[model samples]
Target chain A: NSKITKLESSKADKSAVYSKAESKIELDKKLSLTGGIVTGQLQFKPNKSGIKPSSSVGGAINIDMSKSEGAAMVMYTNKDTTDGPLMILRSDKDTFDQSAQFVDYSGKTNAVNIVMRQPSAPNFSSALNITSANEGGSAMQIRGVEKALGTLKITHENPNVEAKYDENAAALSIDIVKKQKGGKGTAAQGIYINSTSGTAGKMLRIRNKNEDKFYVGPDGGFHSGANSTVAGNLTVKDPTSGKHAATKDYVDEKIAELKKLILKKLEHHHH
Target chain B: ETNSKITKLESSKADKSAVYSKAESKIELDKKLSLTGGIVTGQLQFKPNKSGIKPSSSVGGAINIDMSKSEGAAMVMYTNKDTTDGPLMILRSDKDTFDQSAQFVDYSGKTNAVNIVMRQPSAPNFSSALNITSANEGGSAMQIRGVEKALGTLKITHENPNVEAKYDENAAALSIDIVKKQKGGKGTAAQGIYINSTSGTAGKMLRIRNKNEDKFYVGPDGGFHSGANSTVAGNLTVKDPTSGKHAATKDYVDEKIAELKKLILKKLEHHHH
Candidate 1:
């Protein structure tokens, strides 16, 4: 065993105390150091009560995420701070641009300063909320043309009917049954389907109750399950009813011969 | 190993841990500072501290950071060893380090861009993957530029309807198609397309066109009119008009001509009574 002794003039205040038994030298007070301390592994442990110790300062913790000339940091800034605390990425001291063009590549010389503050509005507490300062703008876009996977469905929580589109079928369907709670089943809603310009469109009827209705045949004939009627006069102009072989021509010849036979025989004698 | 006390090096505070040959490449500390529970007074710095002799990328740490320079900026900086090499930062979950990850997720200094992906959920729980908003009225929310400059734009303005959904699809062919009796609950009813109009405000209920001309439409006065020949499903009626080239019809494509006859009364009288 080596005896721990020190106080040589040249190496007086710089004596090392190493525990050779592989035991840690615990300190009751904070160990302040002026020089850098390097370690292979750094671990943060829970306090004696097994709870994660809280940091008093929010800006105290930072993780550098830069792989470029400038800095990119993810931070949690406190209240009354600058723009907002954000998981931010920077580009060589450029100004924040909200209207940056998207490239297929990353040569974007811009930064997105998506500053987010703590909850201030009621909806701010939602899982995700995006708000605009004004009204009527581009809220969302579904890019790309209709493909095999382009079909999207939208259903309401109140009703079982859904509004969906099928790219495969090249169709859009909105089945909305119009029935308010505890009301007569006579109410109806409508769906308007128009093409490029609304010059021509169809206003489809949405009935609450399901019943047998009329359907058209291939020849444009109407077949009704219940019934139908017309209130006014009806005339179906059809022209193939009259005229057999004993028509006007035969009647005329017979009448002329009857006149001759009448004169030869006893006809109508007025005297 | 029993407890051994080092001979006192003067005073307790005088026993501060310091370095020897501090300006030298290889140096040693007099003591192993027990690093525990420390709160740094100011910002901690990682400098590319130039060392003795010539240097390398690992010497400047190949990375440096400066936080105190700006008021609200913490620059993740670096000073590469030479012009031939640049910097790269790796943030990895090194769980399975058994074999070195040859195929690794590397964020290089340049090239190969990373993508930000978002998955959309089914509705009514639907959310937009990306949302844009305008702060002022008439301000542009979303814009598409033809180039880095100006001219052709497909922008969505913060106005009512935004020029009808901001689509100006002017082209040679028809852009919108509605297949008749096609697939949709929104399809036209068998009675035909419905319009909530008292008069002919909406166009004809039926309109079909031919390549050369307008073929058919159910209205010169809301009655069926067509240029094509028609074979009536049933009887084709006609009101015997006070007449024209049109007369009583026969069982042919066109109507028949009439034949008239008369008998003499005076001749019958002379031959008889």
Candidate 2:
């Protein structure tokens, strides 16, 4: 974040832009100040995708009243693909609702979306168009807030995997929460990732609770624990095996011979 | 660039819902302004023995017209516990004195805390505490009385361990400050470790010091010296058997001398033949 104390124009029409330092501001065409806050809008000359001079605008941040009408928007466009994704944040007092609308028109399935109601609610009411399938509809229309006493949950279509957090306990859980007919036989609760393999389904599974275990593909299974077994033979090498015994045996034998000779001579003389 | 204008709408009370075109007008709303340039007072709801939500409500605020007050504190928090063991952080200023005090409460009997205070002659002082004890108990397990103390310990700790540099009560000992040919390699030094074989004997052996100059295996007896043609240093004493004052039997001396003479004679005779 950068800070600028004041900004002023020098041109006679007060329409000039300057930017150099790491901390700077851009007045694309002109700047305006209303309600003691600086506010303005910018437009970009759209260009082709994969082109050097794409000429795309960075982004936009807007601050408007929350009473009657307010709107904020961010948009990106590519002439080559002719794909313009526009996102808007708007709020109105009559319905006392804040909504976000996304329109991605590049022949994508979810080309248009509107979330006027909370998606986590039991009866989720929103608008989404599967453009690739040429299907669009609205369902369970209800205007209300969703309040949670403790935990809030969002589950997959089959309800086998869920992402939920407990407000009181301040804990979050994300994994297969329930058994489903389509789920793999293993009842292991974890984060399962699957990838396409030439021969079989290559996957990676990370245990989410209790003892931590990581199962990765490519190589086989590996485990932790004293009693843990390996499906493969273990190989180990002694870094100083032959050197140690060779030196010890040579020195000990020479000393033994010297002791025997001295003992024989001294004992014979004493006898 | 096109300079276009659109008509503004005041109200719409028609039978049917009206839709505005994008080129019709730029809908602007009344903005609410919030100024946070002055000091604000608020209650910070800290959870009990366990963590809890923070419900905050701002109280009245006041702007200071005095420029000197700029150096004053921006916020202060004081706690009151039944056991007088509440945590506190205070900053005070007098005509020429500036004092700051911080304390931590220990419900579990062992509280860890840190604080820095600056106050001194004229006006200069600094202090710190970490994992510290309470008032009646011992002082901070770790503390920084001033800038000097902080820097001194840091310097001592950063020295090379191979040199065995350490700080004593009032001194720093750089016993073996060796210079390495390359970083992370063996050191070349002017100091070493001298081990005396027997306590009072002060006999030096296994002298590992300075470059290649090292000595080992020095026992009780053996006397000699060396020169240019010499193969090794010092000597191994060998006297004839009991002849003068050496320890050896007459038989032992005669047998060894006879054997050497015969061997030499035999070698010379064989070569001539």
Candidate 3:
């Protein structure tokens, strides 16, 4: 009864009626999260790093396709009467045309069809281009074209050449057209192979299954297995036997001898 | 006995610091609770929605560094490999058929310098494996090398729009327009293109086919052959037509014609006497 104990203000459930600030818990500093977040749908700020749940507009997501056994990203549309494309990205600029489109092409064996709806921008050069930004780095994306071995056709306005792989023959076939893309002007060099090594090889060779039909040697020697009928004069060089070539004078002399013999006999008979 | 007890009690001092020291001690309202070195529980989470009324059980946890004003990296997941040997980062897929995978195997012994292999066909698909492009003027776009590697045909169309296209049968396969920058270029200028074949390969080198039909060929011994039939629209110059089977040039035919004319003239003069 003698003890006059006062009620403390700090531990009070409610603040004083005249107090300006609200009496709520305020954890001022850091909060460490050991467990992860789970949600119905996640969203971020308009230009934030995750797709917005409400607008469904923006965000980058880590799609672990390894476990999922699907695609990196897939947009599903109605199976029946539906929208334009399964997935489409359009630019916000003036002529807001569809920049890219991804369609589910179940008709063929190929599942996903990528249509480059963007117009030709000559500055960009290629529609879909893969290039190594670094110089010393490897530009080897494709190790080999093992399956469905077909022709690698490189055609343009100034069509250079075409190469086809003969699987049965296990050989390469090249097609060098007479002219460029069109039939009007002269064609550029069909194939330019620069081999500046020693003359231990043939520069060009034309062959059949059985033998070396003809070859233009690196040493500038034009060799042939069969006989040659030169349009121009053999301009006869390198004299030898039947193996080597002879001249015009050689045939002239043989005819001269036969004619002389006939003339001599005719004169004798006359006498 | 009472006086002796009072003396022993006075000898023992009260330990006041012991009350606030032990972890098992009761919480005091005046003391600020700080778990400086104590371990927290396993099921703990933070910032449920900043989102804690009483340290949430909501599992919605996140660490957002809202460095909206900072210029550099917003988040950096860093790892060092002086004591380790493996890929820095691996974005891998287990999808069998056309599964795509990428591994940043820079320091790993399997790779050279900075290597990133994005192996494709990660799943069954019709996507082309790769594409290469370069704007490195007067520089190499790519280089494929090995001892002996057989590849498919390479068809390179001229993208150069400035020039025209033409063909001359008598000339070499490669012409001058594509092999640019030469003054006196009529047919094939010097250094336009050179194809060097290994010596002593007993096989065909250049086979000029007319459609599926094999037209002309040149081979090992510099031998030239026509597939179907050959006609020398011009002269057939060769060694003296010693054998009757050999083709005779104009010079030999001229000599023989003159000789026969003279022989016939003498006979005609004789009048069959």
Candidate 4:
């Protein structure tokens, strides 16, 4: 069964908004971390779905999915005024129960931004919607039709997307942030995925303008991300009936590699 | 429009270090080939990499191998005659994964057999069929090979029927086989490999049937047509292997594939009525 859980956005402004959902159900709880300064973490198997609530108690309005089968997506809908979705507070937990890592979505005073967690499954992101407002009550929403995120682990093939911000005004886009160990800590490493600033790499980088471009070249590899515009329109062909045969195996192998890299970094830090 | 009429250019097929004219490893097998009805059967073995399925609606494509059919009922590659003409084979599901070239197999066939080596950078669906066009009317070809850099790709066209095509399905996945059919059409009246949509969406269909009197048989169960034509021979068969030459750990052995391709090329080249 499809389910949705709401958590307080980690924001002071009640005009902003954010939300995400996937097929798995046990992934209960919408994450939050308000005030623009909070940080926290929560971990659990993210592909299960629909576990009955532990209690039928009383007036609890929010649904608890702490034991569900989906990943937690934290949102912060901060309104510049009172007429919109409103400023969201970021909490590590979905109804304040506390089983999550929260990132503050409150107005950070730097720039108006919409931060989102990209889907981790194979081109699995089904859909996404966003709205922003410079004026108090009136916010503008934008989007196109290709909803499914490609596969995960390997890039491009997966449709799912994760988002980050550029220093200036730019259109929204997504990419797979490869996890790696960086910085110096007792010969240690922290899991990190890189994002580009002022440029789009390997993925589409759209601008508010009408100009468009694709980052993938004829050879089908990452082209340098510079002076690129929005993806004009993604063109995918008719569906093939038979299996590609190697696609899944390819992804499974990629997943193992990613996991190995992450674990290596973790162990390198621990010892 | 200077020299727009087929500008001649020097080009040769990419000699792949991964799988090409000749490599370090190889093997071979024998079996029947059939590509009709909803089921497909045949067999071959080589390196195992990654695999899965995808959805498409413009064209039809699937690779199957099972040995339980009439005489020559084995098939390796099939695309619907009704839909787009694209080649839909996304070989590696995970774009980032890597596997060592371990096993290999190559075969020479007098009667029935399958030599399967596929890698697709794209597939088709409701929106677009993998279309590719040539500069002129002569036609163009796309070759896919695996390597550290170019995993597999060429052009995904929207025109040029000879060089491009499409497909339609609900989802796309791939798996190695021991006489298993990984994908088939799901529509009520769909043929061997047809297309169907989810509710509000409509799908297309594609398949093949022999035209002349040479005659292609329907095999044991029924509903599929071969291109052989009954006019010439008495009993014919499609040779596809199952359970013999394929096993885990036997992956990316290319030398044998080159030999097999040579044999098949000869068969396709020197056929006479």
Candidate 5:
């Protein structure tokens, strides 16, 4: 066996202390987060087990139509997988992220219903918080989802989604969806109408890919009969005019009503 | 190796001898030059011409020097006798007073190392006052006492020290008190600590000194007399304590004011009163 001998404490030498240099990382590409309207049907290939469908979504989705900043998104899911037991959906905070999360289901393949609502995505009809965020200028990124990948019937109730445009402010209101679980799903069927041309006023076209007829209007403003057939005339108006045929303010109000209604639905009654 | 060894041996021997010689001298050498009195022992000696009792041009008497190494205690006793020159007993070391090398040297320089058991006296009752104080660098103070017949129309002047001299203990005007002998008959009597011309010049901003410009004098009204020819640049404040009895001169008034200040301080201590 071999062993090393020990020395006196004084035999040790002093050590020096210094700091290490830090390195910085740079980006490879100029990754710009682009925003615009989403019209085509987004493939709702229900990934096997996407929604916890028993978890129903019902709430007041409030959109601040007073001023619509650019790009917007519309999202739908049989269950409010995103809004966790929410009452009031604030366009600013209780909003959606641009990228959609597609989780594969573990069990069976079930069809999912699609949903679209104003301010469905984050910052939809959000007021121009920045001083220079003119009424209708900012660009947006919208998110919409259909629960299952099937030809499911869709209905837009009272409250609606809003995308506004202002000439003087030079702001753009992208795709304005005015109902909670409204539009149909078919990839680009979501329609990206250019409210561009700087506000003299532009038209929003309801694009359909699967069905012959699809209703276009705000929530509470429409009454649907038995076969998911819309009865009352759809009205859209200036956001200020509470009961207009068309307007950013109207859409904003409708979204607010939706938030209140859903919140109430969430309370009192147990699922 | 052999040559280096030899060199080392020689150098060591030389060093040892040098050290031994120094040690021997230190042990056997005399530490002091003794003189007659206890004050004279352990001190160096110097005999200046003044020791012969030879008077100076205006002084009218010899001035002797008995510089001491330390501020050790000593006593002096003299009788009353009038003489032409006033006598003085001064104590100085290295600070402020004497300059043996004339460069404002003090005892620190070992200049005038020691002087003690020395005696210098005049006939008596000299108009000029003699003062003893600390020297510039080597400050040594002497305890002194003087006896004189009635000070005659005399200036009992105690002109403090020179421009740079300061008090070892008491430096302010009111700090020291003076006593005088009572006059017998038909003669005017006067005795007090006066701020004379020289004092004014020496004291500067510290105290009022003699300035032909504004010399404070005794007034006929039993108070400080100043010249109509002179004006007091400083204001006069007073705290009268009831009806006063004795008529006071300038010096006496100063004492009264000092007493007043003392009382006020005492009251303030009690209650910030």
Candidate 6:
């Protein structure tokens, strides 16, 4: 076979290799494929020795059309785990025109699916939506899994606020979650909220799909078994009239009722 | 039949320079160019203009992959009428890092920018972080706004009993702004925190801006002033009763006599010294 080749090489510097074999151009190092589609796997392998297959890491970008449902996937694998074929793009054959779908996968139990929609008419809703499924029973788990400390936090920076859940606690907790001055480690202020159950039941309970309660505020009086001693004056508002009702009004009404009963007894005795 | 042929169907109403040969292998469309298929190019450039050439105003999705740098970047952008000339939403990636950023622009001179970053991090730390900025210099706010027509509400809840911000507008006070909780609803009492400026001199004042009222305040003399009437349910006691103003108890008068005798003895001892 006869071929024309171009090689620009230097001993101390970089080299460029170019070859034209009809319509196919091949280069040994760093081939630039332009204005075309590649169908095979692009893999990155380890360069050094003494690292066993079980102790090294490798990854690949895959474009596979062999199955009826085609997908473009990127995957990473390390020692002790082959974590993904992180299917960034996939085509499901369920739709009329083979609609594009985005999917994120981790291990075998967690996956996130983003579905895009087009409205037939005018709409006031979001165009992109996300949903997750966790087969391991954690719908969304953001924490350290190996008994180490971790945090899952959502932060707003301008007013310097954060909502964080620490991995040390069985439930949600915080470490300097809010600051008005946006200072760090300077005796800042933080806000925390939780559920409470009173002596009756669930006092400060907010529920949506799940419900929790704890005993929260002052238990009516000062103590659980308590007393209320006021210094100057006491007033109670009537629920119906919204006016102040006093102990003197009740005493006068009771006295009048007793007088009527005595007068009725006298009348009966005379007859 | 063997020779290649070129067709130029010319019209007098429109210019024919679109079909003419151009330098640098560039195509110039005298009018709008319609695409029935995708264009594969080494680089795509949108010419700089002030007249605003809106390429895809109503279209929803576009992707840009720029690999000219050492790190390759991929960005997906969205378009909306309510946003600036730039893409309102973008999901970007570089190397192994991914970031999602959104910008909300108002013609009324306000902008809100939000960025969420996810990285391959070291152990014992989270892989993701977030930041939000709302530059509403005007009086408007980025409200966690809601309407509750039923018994339902939007709530922030947790198992740790210290995540509530209670602002009583009626009292112009914060029962709990950023405070921790103790067991059995006991916590540190919040100290002197004020909201607005006071009159004549400076002191702690809680003023409701919308109501134009100073609902509660701490005076310069270290006394609290409640706008509403204060109540004391039991007996009232005055330590120093002014003559002819308050009737002094007999025990109090006797105590005063004893206190006078002790003061006289102290004075006599001082004179002797």
Could you give the C-alpha RMSD of every candidate to the true structure, in order shown?
Answer: 21.4, 32.3, 19.1, 41.7, 58.6, 23.0
In candidate 5, position A109 carries an lDDT of 16
DockQ of each: 0.05, 0.01, 0.06, 0.01, 0.00, 0.02
For lDDT, candidate 1 versus 3, the one ahead is: 3
Better of 1 and 4 by lDDT: 1
lDDT of 6 at A141: 20
Interface RMSD of each: 20.7, 32.3, 19.1, 35.6, 58.1, 21.7
Runs in model 5 deviating more than 4 A are A1-271, B1-7, B15-23, B28-273
Instruction: Report the poorest 10 consecutive residues by lDDT, candidate 2 chain A.
Output: A142-151
Angstrom error of the Cα, residue B59, model 6: value is 6.8
For candidate 3, lDDT tens digit of each residue in A129-215?
Answer: 232222222223222111221112121111112222211221233444433345554344444434432324455444444445554
Candidate 3 chain A weakest lDDT stretch, 10 residues: A150-159
Sort candidate 3 into its docking category: incorrect
* Model 5 error, position B159 (Å): 31
Global CA lDDT computed for model 1: 0.26
- Top of the candidates by DockQ: 3
Give the distance in Å from residue B164's predicted Cα in candidate 2 to where it truly belongs.
49
TM-score of each: 0.22, 0.14, 0.31, 0.14, 0.12, 0.23
lDDT agreement with native, every candidate: 0.26, 0.21, 0.32, 0.21, 0.22, 0.24
lDDT score of residue A124 within candidate 6: 31
Model 5, position A160: C-alpha lDDT score: 14
Sorted on lDDT, best first, the list reads 3, 1, 6, 5, 2, 4
Residues B1-273, candidate 4: write the lDDT tens digits. Answer: 532321211112121332212122211101112111111121122221233211111111121222222222121122222222222222211111112111111222221111111222154222211222111111111112111111111111111112212221111111001111113312121111112211211111112111222122222122223232111112122222122222111132233345455655565466544
Which ranges in model 6 have alpha carbons more than 4 Å from their true place?
A1-271, B1-43, B48-130, B134-141, B151-153, B159-273
> CAPRI band of model 2?
incorrect
For candidate 1, lDDT tens digit of each residue in B218-249?
43234544343223324434433222223233
Q: What residue runs in model 4 are displaced by over 4 Å at the alpha carbon?
A: A1-162, A165-210, A213-271, B1-71, B75-273
TM-scores of chain A across candidates: 0.23, 0.17, 0.30, 0.17, 0.13, 0.21
